[PDB]
């Protein structure tokens, strides 16, 4: 079957095709339709665009900051750019062309455009073009760009290098520097902020005969083929464009040019790309049975959180991935929470990779937390190359008055920290790698804890620690204390902490101790807190206060009715005077967040009043919502309502569903934590995959649209694949050598030694 | 030396006279001129003017909330509209008028007008008229109204009660029931939210012979009288209105119709008045020699404070007074900080009982801390009949957008509490009042230091307590840390409970205790505390930090600047995203406040240096800022800055100098702070008294603009009088029994013992 949506469908389930060309939507489908290896992100643009239609070839630890506030990755010169003239008219793409087809194949992230056009004197066109940046050779972009007349005609083939991008926080390269080599341009330029250097080689390759020549000028260079192409005789150029910068190597423009001279053919570097993709797809692959359009949708999201993730060097998932320069490639908590369980259960080492990013950042939280006054590592909203706060104190504008707004999205939201320790502690519970807590997750969590034990504020008639003036998941508040989400966080962060103290041994202990200068009266403020902080609980109604005088702010339901008191817009609906501030609309989820990440905590029937509550007050306004929600309607027996958010987190993006742009800042581009939690719908929502102590966890629901799933998990070392039909669930234990597991299903206890095992449901 | 300013003259140095009728300022000169004696207040209005002309009677203790949002006094209806018609045509102001002039009577609270006008058929008609509200009888006040024709004409009086009255946020009574009596009018109403009874009476007299006819409509009702004047023979109408409610005896109705009935004549009531006004004017007035000018103004604001402050009931000092229904009739921290120095030191007794109304609302500030999830007594900001809280969440709208703002006055500016400990501890220290602090100020204090105690936080590991996400007397900056003013507020108070817990009588000490439920385990908290709190201190430029971080804002000197990046005049410049949040920019005095309040904790050199580095970054937007850095400047040996914020403060009304308006709420009235204030720039400012243990002290200084100035002042029971000149200070002990007194002067010596000394001031 075949129709998604718009005017998008999938023939096979690895490929998403758009049929009609909408010069409107340039930008959703460069975001779309780009392609990308975890160095670098190329939006999907057609060969001729610039900077007008969105082109931006994302180039990762490549920061900049320009502007003197906004610090983001560059965009770099595109050394892919190609305009046809066919006697003297430009080739531009028309709404009404004759014939236009775009594909993405997921398969093996190759982005293509199949176009014909009627020309003036009358010759038809036809262009089908093709690109891949290589996950074998992380540096390169390659393109095949085919053109064909059918009629005998003069033509003029333009191809080069443009210094002229696009670049939505100002221009990050300057000093462009021309030079030529054997095979074709290259541009040489320096950073604006910290002077790093970026090499771009084009190589280039034309398989028929021309007139060439050159011209080089300050916003790009390159060169013009004239050509007769003869009637149905296809002309065939192809290209490589090559980046380095020196934060990647000494010497970038001869790494550079030493990658161009090793080139091989287009499809000889297809081939080993596809090959790549294999493998990568045979660790992360969820298939859905009998729902092609979910499939894809999967897929897609899938596919967008690997060319996100880089994997050559210790760097962040950007919150937008590398799809254009929004969310300054840099690591959010989506980055923990939202991105790394695919990778915790399908890769683990990615997943170690990520923590091991945070621990080679722990000096950029030790210096926010000293700047602002703490102890610990207070981990930055923002984090780029070293774990200093990016993220500014102006983030909005009030676009009633022009004025910047003050949101403390920087300095009081400060879940980030044990949200972190959480992840830490989660990714030793499912692997056992005790070495990586030997030498590193300790630190972390000590680190964090010790933040928390200097946030925190000692209330003596009350005899209890609270933690005050935060900001929580729900981003519209601020100034809130005893964010339940927070406060359930820093107790848990807390409880490992006491954990690791009573349960490593001597010598590793007294080396992490002595590295971070951690003492006995710090533990018994920790042990003292452990037993006297303040946690927000159930209430007589069961419900969960999401932080202290929540109940006393104006019931909106449906939450969506406060969208009828805004004067623009594109205005900030937060703090500190939008339309929800005095009001319980949240953006997301916050209460119902935390059962994302503790499901054993509370009993099912409280989970399922705290949603009953608190869905209709979300306004889901966050891309980061729906999948929180889904996974805990799932196991509360609201699966088909899980499917409708399954639903909506799976298109944002493909069915173009969120705004570009608020309180004048762009937050357009793709939404990575969404792509992340793709998997985990299935995964933990749907299938109810959870790990509580050593123990197992499965719950298996399935929506009608679906009639079973397969996905596998890595546990403790052990793979299992785990299919789940109407009737049936059943674990088998691939894994080159097998220990016994006991699982819980559905809270029955089973043993799977053996290979495998089967269960009704 | 008549002038003041705009067109304002003195002509005794006891009177404000206006000489051009300006339609346009209706607001201010109602204010200015207005009448009072603390049970009402009767804006300056003339006899034909109405809810247009901004006329109001406001009536204490009548509190009500029929908007659903603000609880303020009622405006009552006026027993006092008088139209007056020639030959049919009617009287009316025109700013082009043969003569006006206006005239308030400081000595006596007479507020007067005369005006003649020519009238279409050829007459010239003069009216002279005149009103005072009864210090004598507080619940009446008292016109007479004379007109006189220079040719024979037909004329009418139409006099009655006018229903329809000017109310800020909606009609506060209803249900009103006509009435008549033998000498006028009646009509008796009920409040809309509590539905307490409010009765006005209205006693008319005419000494002409006149053909009079009721009338009464839904708006009101009345009488004309029909007359036929003679050419230079006034007619004379003399009036009372008198006003009660159930909220000051059990039957209101009948309560007003006996003082109707017992209403001497004007003349007979008006000398009563001045009787009041001679024993007013002999406790408070404050003479300046040689400035007619300041000395009038001075007279002019503290007549203000007078007029405001409530003396018949337990009632609040309200921050706007009785001028209008601004800042609610209620107290603010204004009462104890800026209203009751003037009475602490010339007339106790007020002050005693203003502390004794903070005690018997201590069961709001009760409320109000356990409502927010804090202990002991969280004193509202704005607080009317109970103390519980009557400042809304929603004080303000952004301008810009039409959306209310929320400003944080009522739950986070927490000193008012300490205020009031405060102002309890230097009661007792100036009059030696044992027995309040025996019976009342103990628990209040108590109550104070265990809100603090609940407010405050521990910080493990920076081992001390802090006072997090306040709001300083610097109204701009909100959710800021350890303001340095509270923080000194709060050890203040830490400290006088701690000194009562150590000297008071056992059997006192259980009697409070057990009525509060006062634990040891609470005392040794405030104790650890006090050993344990920070506080910010000067640091190595001599520089107190406002509040943590403040150093870290925009500095623009002079900080007036700031306007510059207004986009509307009238926008709130403060929380949350006003021009000045960012900046260094400071509403009042804060850090200088707390140089005003303890005098002797830090050495001149530090005053003189926060002086100077604050006041350039201050707006002086409040009516409060400019009385506060006289007091400072005067005695750094800044006598002559001093000055002029004497005048900036002085002139506040008079001059008209502040807005009424901002972020769309009334805040305009009688600036009654300020009032108050102006007898302490003169007495605590240039004449430097102050009490510091058993330490009285004095430093007296001299501005150039006078030649002297004296003053009365009650210490420990002991009535003396100062007088300063150029070159000596004489302080003669008025007191009926003396008894001996230390006496610093300029920090030394002389033990006063003997009727009058006199010192060199060289
Ligand atoms: O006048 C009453 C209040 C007005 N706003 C600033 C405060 O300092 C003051 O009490
Ligand atoms: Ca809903
Ligand atoms: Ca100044």
Not at 170 to 187: E, M, R
Not at 361 to 375: I, P, Q, S, V
């Amino acid at each position: 079957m075949h129709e998604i949506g718009e005017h998008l469908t999938t023939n096979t389930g690895w490929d998403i095709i758009k049929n009609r060309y909408e010069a409107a939507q340039a930008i959703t489908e460069g975001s779309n339709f780009m392609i990308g290896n975890g160095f670098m992100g190329y939006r999907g643009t057609f060969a001729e665009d610039g900077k007008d239609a969105y082109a931006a070839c994302i180039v990762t630890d490549t920061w900049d900051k320009a502007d003197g506030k906004w610090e983001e990755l560059s965009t770099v010169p595109n050394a892919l750019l190609t305009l046809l003239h066919v006697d003297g008219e430009p080739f531009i793409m028309s709404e009404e062309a004759a014939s236009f087809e775009r594909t993405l194949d997921l398969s093996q992230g190759v982005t293509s455009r199949k176009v014909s056009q009627r020309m003036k004197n009358g010759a038809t066109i036809t262009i089908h073009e093709e690109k891949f940046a290589s996950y074998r050779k992380k540096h390169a972009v390659l393109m095949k760009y085919t053109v064909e007349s059918d009629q005998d005609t003069d033509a003029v083939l333009d191809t080069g290098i443009d210094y002229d991008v696009w670049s939505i926080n100002g221009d990050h390269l300057q000093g462009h520097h021309y030079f030529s080599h054997p095979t074709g341009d290259g541009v040489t330029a320096k950073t604006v902020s910290y002077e790093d250097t970026v090499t771009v080689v084009e190589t280039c390759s034309l398989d028929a005969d021309a007139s060439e020549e050159d011209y080089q000028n300050p916003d790009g260079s390159g060169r013009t083929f004239s050509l007769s192409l003869e009637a149905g005789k296809p002309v065939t150029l192809e290209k490589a464009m090559i980046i380095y910068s020196s934060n990647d190597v000494d010497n970038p423009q001869d790494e550079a040019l030493l990658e161009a001279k090793h080139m091989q053919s287009y499809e000889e570097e297809k081939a080993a790309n596809r090959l790549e993709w294999d493998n990568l797809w045979s660790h992360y692959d969820v298939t859905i049975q009998n729902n092609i359009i979910d499939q894809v949708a999967l897929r897609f999201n899938i596919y967008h959180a690997i060319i996100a993730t880089p994997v050559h060097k210790s760097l962040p998932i950007g919150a937008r991935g590398l799809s254009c320069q929004a969310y300054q490639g840099a690591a959010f908590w989506d980055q923990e929470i939202y991105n790394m369980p695919m990778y915790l259960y399908s890769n683990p080492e990615i997943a170690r990779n990520i923590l091991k990013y945070r621990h080679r950042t722990l000096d950029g939280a030790r210096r926010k937390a000293k700047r602002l006054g703490y102890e610990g590592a207070y981990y930055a909203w923002i984090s780029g190359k070293t774990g200093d706060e990016l993220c500014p104190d102006f983030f909005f504008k009030d676009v009633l008055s022009g004025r910047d707004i003050r949101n403390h999205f920087n300095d009081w939201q400060i879940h980030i920290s044990p949200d972190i320790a959480y992840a830490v502690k989660k990714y030793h519970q499912v692997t056992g790698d005790d070495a990586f807590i030997r030498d590193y997750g300790a630190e972390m969590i000590f680190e964090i804890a010790r933040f928390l034990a200097s946030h925190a504020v000692y209330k003596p008639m009350r005899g209890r620690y609270e933690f005050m003036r935060v900001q929580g998941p729900d981003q519209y508040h601020e100034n809130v204390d005893n964010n339940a989400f927070t406060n359930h966080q820093a107790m848990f962060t807390l409880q490992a902490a006491d954990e690791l103290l009573q349960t490593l041994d001597e010598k590793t202990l007294s080396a992490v101790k002595e590295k971070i200068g951690l003492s006995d009266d710090e533990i018994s403020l920790w042990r003292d807190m452990l037993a006297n902080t303040y946690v927000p609980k159930p209430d007589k109604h069961g419900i969960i206060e999401q932080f202290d005088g929540y109940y006393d702010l104006e019931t909106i339901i449906p939450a969506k009715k406060v969208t009828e008191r805004l004067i623009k817009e594109d205005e900030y609906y937060g703090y500190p005077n939008g339309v929800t501030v005095r009001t319980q609309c949240i953006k997301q989820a916050d209460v119902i967040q935390l059962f994302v990440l503790h499901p054993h905590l509370y009993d099912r029937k409280t989970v399922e009043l705290n949603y009953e509550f608190y869905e209709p007050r979300t306004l889901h306004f966050s891309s980061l919502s729906p999948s929180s929600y889904a996974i805990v309607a799932a196991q509360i027996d609201k699966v088909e309502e899980a499917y409708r958010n399954f639903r909506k987190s799976v298109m944002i993006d493909l069915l173009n569903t969120n705004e570009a742009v608020s309180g004048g800042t762009f937050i357009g581009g793709i939404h990575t934590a969404a792509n992340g939690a793709s998997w985990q719908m299935v995964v933990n929502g749907f299938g109810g995959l959870s790990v509580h102590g050593d123990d197992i966890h499965l719950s298996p629901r399935l929506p009608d649209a679906w009639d079973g799933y397969t996905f596998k998990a890595i546990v403790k070392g052990q793979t299992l694949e785990v299919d789940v039909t109407k009737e049936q669930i059943t674990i088998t234990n691939k894994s080159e050598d097998r220990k016994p597991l006991t699982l819980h299903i559905f809270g029955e206890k089973s043993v799977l030694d053996s290979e495998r095992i089967t269960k009704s449901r």
